[PDB]
Write a protein that binds this DNA or RNA. Sequence first.
RNA 1: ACAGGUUUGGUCCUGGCCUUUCUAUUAAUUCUUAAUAAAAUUACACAUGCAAGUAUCCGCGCCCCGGUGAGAAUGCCCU
RNA 2: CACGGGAAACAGCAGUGAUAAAAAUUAAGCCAUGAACGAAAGUUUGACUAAGUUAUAUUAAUUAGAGUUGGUAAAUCUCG
Lengths: 77, 190, 292, 55, 49, 169, 86, 117
Amino acid sequence: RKTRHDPPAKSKAGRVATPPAVDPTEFFVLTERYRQYRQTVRALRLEFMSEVRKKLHEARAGVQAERKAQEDAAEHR
Amino acid sequence: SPYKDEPWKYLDSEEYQNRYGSRPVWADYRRNHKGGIPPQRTRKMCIRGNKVAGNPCPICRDQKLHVDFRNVKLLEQFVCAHTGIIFHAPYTGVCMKQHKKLTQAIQKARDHGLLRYHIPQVEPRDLDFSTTHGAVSSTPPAPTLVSGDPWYPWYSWKQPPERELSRLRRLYQGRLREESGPPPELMPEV
Amino acid sequence: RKPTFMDEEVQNILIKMTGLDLQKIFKPALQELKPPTYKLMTQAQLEEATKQAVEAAKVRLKMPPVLEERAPINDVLAEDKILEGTETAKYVFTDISYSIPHRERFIVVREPSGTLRKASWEERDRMIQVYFPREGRRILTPVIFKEENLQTMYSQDQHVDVLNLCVAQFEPDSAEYIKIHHHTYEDIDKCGKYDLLRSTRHFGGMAWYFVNKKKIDGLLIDQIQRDLVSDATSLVHLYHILHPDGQSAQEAKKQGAEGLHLIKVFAKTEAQKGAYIELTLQAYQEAFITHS
Amino acid sequence: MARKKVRPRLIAELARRVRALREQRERPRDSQRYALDYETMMRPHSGNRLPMRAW
Amino acid sequence: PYPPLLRAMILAQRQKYGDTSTEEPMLNLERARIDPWDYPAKLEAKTKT
Amino acid sequence: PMKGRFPIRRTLQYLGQGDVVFKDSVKVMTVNYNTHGELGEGARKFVFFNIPQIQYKNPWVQITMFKNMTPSPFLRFYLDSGEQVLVDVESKSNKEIVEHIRKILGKNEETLEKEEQEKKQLSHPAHFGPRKYCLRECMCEVEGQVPCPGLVPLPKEMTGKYKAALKAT
Amino acid sequence: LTRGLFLGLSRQETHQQLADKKSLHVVEFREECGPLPIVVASPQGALRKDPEPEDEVPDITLDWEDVKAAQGMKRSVWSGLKRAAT
Amino acid sequence: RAYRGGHLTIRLALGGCTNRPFYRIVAAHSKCPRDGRFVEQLGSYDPLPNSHGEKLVALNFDRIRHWIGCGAHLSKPVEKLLGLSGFYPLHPMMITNAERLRRKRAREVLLASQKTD
RNA sequence: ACAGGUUUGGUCCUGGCCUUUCUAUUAAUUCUUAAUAAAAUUACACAUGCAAGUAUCCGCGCCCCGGUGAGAAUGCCCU
RNA sequence: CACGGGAAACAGCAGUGAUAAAAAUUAAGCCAUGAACGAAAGUUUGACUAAGUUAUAUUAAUUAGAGUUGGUAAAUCUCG
Ligand SMILES: [Mg+2]
Ligand SMILES: [Mg+2]
Ligand SMILES: [Mg+2]
Ligand SMILES: [Mg+2]
Ligand SMILES: [Mg+2]
Ligand SMILES: [Mg+2]
Ligand SMILES: [Mg+2]
Ligand SMILES: [Mg+2]
Ligand SMILES: [Mg+2]
Ligand SMILES: [Mg+2]
Ligand SMILES: [Mg+2]
Ligand SMILES: [Mg+2]
Ligand SMILES: [Mg+2]
Ligand SMILES: [Mg+2]
Ligand SMILES: [Mg+2]
Ligand SMILES: [Mg+2]
Ligand SMILES: [Mg+2]
Ligand SMILES: [Mg+2]
Ligand SMILES: [Mg+2]
Ligand SMILES: [Zn+2]
Ligand SMILES: [Zn+2]
């Protein structure tokens, strides 16, 4: 690509981006569908964060982990 | 080749027995090369059209040897009886074209039970066979599934309010387009 | 309380029924071969090595479980009418994880019509092989399992190879597995070729199929002609176990027969070639006592 | 990483101080920074044109 | 409602442990509330707690 | 090899056949032994034979041998917690030393099996990539799928040049 | 080369003579036949019930050539070539 | 390599053969190349139909949900595939494309009917 | 290395060189079509074109991709 | 190193001089991936894709030329 120190092209120095055609009746329902989809994926993201929290807690200080931490100490002595 | 249909007839014939006998077709064949160690790659193809390139190959100097999956006696000579592996081209002496054809024919005859090969004892895939799990059994249907409703209420196309359409059209003036109502449910064909 | 193939009362009979043949179990196959190892032992060490070989032959003779036909999978999880023709082909999705058994994987297929259904058995088994390949299995259907090549291999008395290949390829509760195993079991009693499975790991399955199908005429005469009577009394005991309500089973209880007489009641009551069975038993009786 | 023959580079750290001083002393005031040419919609400071939806 | 495959995942998950309850599993939206794009954001430094 | 009293002990097979794996708390093994007397034949044979097998499977454990300072042969295991494990070896044999060490501080068979069962999980059968880490390179070579274009040429309907040519007209 | 080859081929030890000289059974363990105790020669005569001293560490005369061959360090291109048949 | 920033993204790496694409569903850094270093491989995606005629896609749902809970961003085609699998809700871009296709079929049949008379 | 040629009137031993095998570049001769992979002289200097845009302004990215092997014995693996 | 000093930078895609035994198009697009932006429809990307050129290499064939003939090492008749 391009770097910070290279000048822009002459044909694009005098160019600005043009927005495409807009359909209102499609755009409104499209945006409400975007919001309805994003809230669902946000809830699923929260669910996965919670399950990761449960798994990491059960891996660090779990009921099974404490059993091993005690039986190893007993067998050592 | 007079047979053209039954390759093993030549192997059972007498002109094979008096010429080769109980020995393989490649027993008397000796390959000529540049030193004491032959090249790892043999001749690619020795029969170009009608011309024969010098000393021909054991199965390939005689046109009555047809490489095929039916004649197991011919294919057995190129497969070791003890180890069960296919002899390579430097081992046998055939040109590489006939070598690939030999490998393909050996595999294709093996896949038909004519040529024997090793069958190891393989344990069953599953340690415990349980069909009661929900992976293979039916699941209780959803209330939206039993009703005929899509999974989520926003899946269907709902008509936007006229006030919101006007609000959009006011802000997006100059970029407006033709409106489109609810789409048809079923797609027609051509 | 129907008897099961994995029940002890059946398995203990089947092990003695198959018997132990070291020269057949530990046979030189067609694999890559290596120079042997030599060490010198005493008589006791030789006996210890032989019994270790017997214990290994037990694992070699570990029986494959024979199961009933599984129910076809027909269920729909969701239906999206919007995807009626957006895609031409169907999307198959596999759940891959090493910590889950292959019986609990979710194999879900989105049809081009827009529905989401559970993958059927033939697609599920193919996908498990695609994403978890094991040696001896083919993703596509092999040509060897056709009825022409199967007869061709049967003519070369390779039924042991047929059974091992079928066990390796197919799942014991599938449909083609049972179909091909019943085909080999019908060929074996059509031709009287029980020798191939005399001491392999597939003898119990064939015996348990015959006790289900009530086809014992050839098996009993084969076992008698092979001078095996402990392999006939146990067989008729299996018949009585799996058919408790029968004129053959109740007559044994009412009369109190010994192991030698357990065969006569079967061959008189429910046997189809009873004349041949009686003639074979008479021929064995008139010869064994006189010669020994 | 950490070697025995690591050269004590001083110009690289002097340039940090020089650019830090020049960042504050020559800080562009927001007036001329956000100044706008209303004919070409061209920012005199940064050199960017305004989006056409903001015309 | 949960998506189809994910919902079937829980219906198979609790069935293995033996939960005979056929209650329909829901997905919460209490903490899924989000601000629109027109909502401006703060320009102060974030304090790490 | 040929040089040495016992050439066999300098082979990878001999080093691999010795199954003595220390715990994560084991740090130092200091062996002290004598070079005279019939009592220490077992300790001398242990130093001669089993030290390489232990070292091969415990590369991070520091093992140090000492000769002719204490009249009694012994071992001293310095752990991570600071506890010093003193093992007296006066008439124990070469095999007895190894069995005692494995008994007092070592890893169980189930402990080793769980570690190796976890290790085999890293290489995943369904993954794709290089032959060093994965079993398949390109997904063409799978039997049921589309073959590789470098082996079986694709039909004209799937090539990109024909699709561009039809769109051009 | 010929003299040494013939001397070595003549100085071989038959399994039967090994069994005779050590009064123990000679048992062959094929890799393909699994753990099957294949017996090749029997020690005719007095069979000793005392077993041979099991050496935990064998004192054998190894060679760096075969050690390299076994450890897979033979990276020479002259070892794994394809040659003609017998 | 050292990066100034970036985010973990579960995306598709085109690792394949000419006129024969093949994607690896992998979790990799945003500033790394498409076929460059990655964190952990998840699944595979096969763009062409096979002999039986199904489009074969692999998902390692457990690791995918683990990484997404850990904070892995998602790409649009990955969202489409996950929605088609049933693990995630359908992406609205697919819905609007299906509606556009419906309108294209409607105009096609209209023009076909009008061109025949 | 399964080796072979080569010292001497001649033999044995020691000992070096070369040949036999595979791969990559350039040169010569010849040459028909496709598929795939790769395009490799230069950290010597560059005419010219393109390669960083997006957006209701703010802002975000702008050797990130990609290119190269000059220097560094640099470095591999590990907290 | 990069405040500063030489001094006006392709060790980006193509291409040009010198040099070297060493020789790809100064061509088309974001349809599909990855990246950037925007809430978004969506835009850009000489990355990438689809291509043009090259016996550098493997495969199929529509093609037959090169090397060698004292020993190592397969193979020579007659002329100067
Ligand atoms: Mg900007
Ligand atoms: Mg490519
Ligand atoms: Mg001399
Ligand atoms: Mg050239
Ligand atoms: Mg680079
Ligand atoms: Mg230097
Ligand atoms: Mg610099
Ligand atoms: Mg430069
Ligand atoms: Mg640059
Ligand atoms: Mg260039
Ligand atoms: Mg030039
Ligand atoms: Mg070149
Ligand atoms: Mg040129
Ligand atoms: Mg040129
Ligand atoms: Mg272009
Ligand atoms: Mg793109
Ligand atoms: Mg786009
Ligand atoms: Mg070439
Ligand atoms: Mg002359
Ligand atoms: Zn030929
Ligand atoms: Zn491929």
